[PDB]
Structure formats: C-alpha cells, structure tokens
Amino acid sequence: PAILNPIARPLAENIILTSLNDVYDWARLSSLWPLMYGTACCFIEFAAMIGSRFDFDRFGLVPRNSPRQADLIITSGTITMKMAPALVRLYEQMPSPKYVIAMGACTITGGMFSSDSYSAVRGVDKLIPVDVYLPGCPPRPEAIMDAIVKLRKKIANEHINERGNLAQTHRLFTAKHKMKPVPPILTGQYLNAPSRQAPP
C-alpha cells in the first residue's frame, strides 16, 4: 500500500442565521464555565490564578465544584491508572458541549514518569479528547491564559448546521464469558474489627 495509517476522504447561507450563529458562539465565548480538577501542584498553580494577582475571573470563568454545570474541564497533575476511570466518569457526566484543556507535562504526555514507571498514565489524550494542549512543568499562568485564548479562538470555529457531531453511536455487542465469582472488597470495617481489639 506504501502509505501507513491512511485518512479517508469526507452551499449558500443566510445573513440572519449567520448572525444567530454569531450570537450563539459569543454566548459560549462569554460564559465559559470551567471545572476545577487537580491532584498535584498544578491545582495550586490554577488556584494562584483565582487569587487577586492575575484575575482569572475577569474573562468570565467562575470556579464550580460541580461536574454538571461546566462546559470545560481542566485536567491537571500526575494521573494514576486507578484515577483514570474516575476521570472518564467525570468527563462523561458532563453535558455534551464540553471542552478539554490539559495543563502540565505529565498530563499531555508521560512527563518525567515516562522512563521508569508502571502506574502513571502516559498521556491524557488516551483517556479524553484534548482540544488545546499545554506543555510546561509547571507552566506559567500567563501560558494558561494563552491556552484559554487559543481555546476561545477554537470555540468560534463551530457551526450551527454542522452541529450533528456531539453524540455517540451504539455499536453494541453481546457475548458471554466463563469467569469465576470474586469475593467482595472491604467497605469500612477498620476500628471495630475482630482482629484489632483481640490479639491473635
């Protein structure tokens, strides 16, 4: 074939619909409600922008702890594979017009934990579709604002007639297995344990 990994190949509009699309894009550009998710010092670098020195609030972004009223998630920090289904569920529980900004060197790629590591996830793009990458270990908060500016330049590229892309197809398949039933995992049972007070 001589070409590895090939790419498959894939008009008059109105002025009032164009102005309505400009208003619809300007509303998403003006609100831009983020989500604060951080497990390391990148969360401290994000919280340094919320303080009254860089004024991250002035672009319209307000801090929310809810992964349901945020049209943008900001993953940050060294990601363990035990936290990867947690991040997948936190991304899936968000509404459909969502965006991903990945901040950090260990987030967008393996980072420093890419030579001798067995638990760190080498890249968040294997988990969630990253729109704007952000290299840096740790990046400047001005670079985070530059990534916000590039995300705002990327949001206005969307269309109101080509809105039929924010969905997931079914492609269901049903098969059986022959695995053995597992005993359950511990839920509590730390202080009032029969092997704790009574010495064996």
């Binding site: 899936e92 529980q93 459909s96 924010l166 079914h170």
Partner: protein, 121 residues
C-alpha cells in the same frame, strides 16, 4: 349574590402570564437543543467511584419535630392575625385574653424548649 370586592382580575392574569412562561422557556430549550435527549449511558452522580455503600437513610425524628412545632405555631399565628387587625377600637379585655393566649403558648414553647423536642446534635 353578587361578586363585588376590590379586584381579583390582576391576580388571575398575572398567574396565567407567570405560568405560561416557564413551560415556554422549557419548550425553547428543547427546541434549541444541540442534538437531542436520550443519553445512551444513564448514570447517577457519585463523586469519584461506583456506588459501593447503600441506598438507605438512617431513621431520624428531627425534621418531623421541627415541622410539628412549625404547624403548632403557625396555627397560633393564624389566630394571632385578626386580634392585631381588629385592635383599633376593641379595648383592653381582648388584650388581656390575648395576653393569656400568648402566655399559654409561651408555656408551650418553654415545654418544647426544656426537653428534647428539637435537638440537632
């Protein structure tokens, strides 16, 4: 009989206008949806994991006791309304009997305050 009062068409019209708008806003939000509803994988809100504990609430009494003292004092406030309305030419015996009423309900409040009738420990 005849229906003569100060007026009630404003209340009904404002109720109709204020009740027509939320379902209209919901219909507009359903019309200007990006694609549709009917999410393929429906999951409830847990913070970071799967539900491992249980869907049961501990049997408490603090909400029912608060609503009990609330309805007991609300039907007192309802009886306390027309005495304060009609206190323009009535007199002093009504004030004495309302003072007896207020003192009896204050004794009721002291009985509810002394024992464990409301305590969110």
């Amino acid at each position: 009989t005849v229906f003569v009062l100060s007026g009630y068409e404003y209340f009904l019209g404002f109720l109709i206008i204020c009740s027509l708008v939320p379902v209209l806003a919901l219909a507009a939000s359903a019309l200007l949806r990006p694609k549709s509803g009917r999410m393929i994988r429906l999951t409830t809100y847990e913070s970071g994991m799967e539900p491992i504990g249980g869907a049961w609430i501990q049997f408490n009494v603090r909400y029912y006791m608060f609503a009990l003292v609330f309805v007991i004092f609300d039907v007192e406030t309802v009886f306390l309304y027309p005495w304060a309305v009609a206190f323009h030419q009535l007199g002093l015996l009504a004030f004495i009997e309302a003072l007896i009423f207020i003192a009896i309900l204050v004794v009721a409040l002291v009985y509810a305050w002394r024992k464990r009738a409301l305590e969110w420990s």
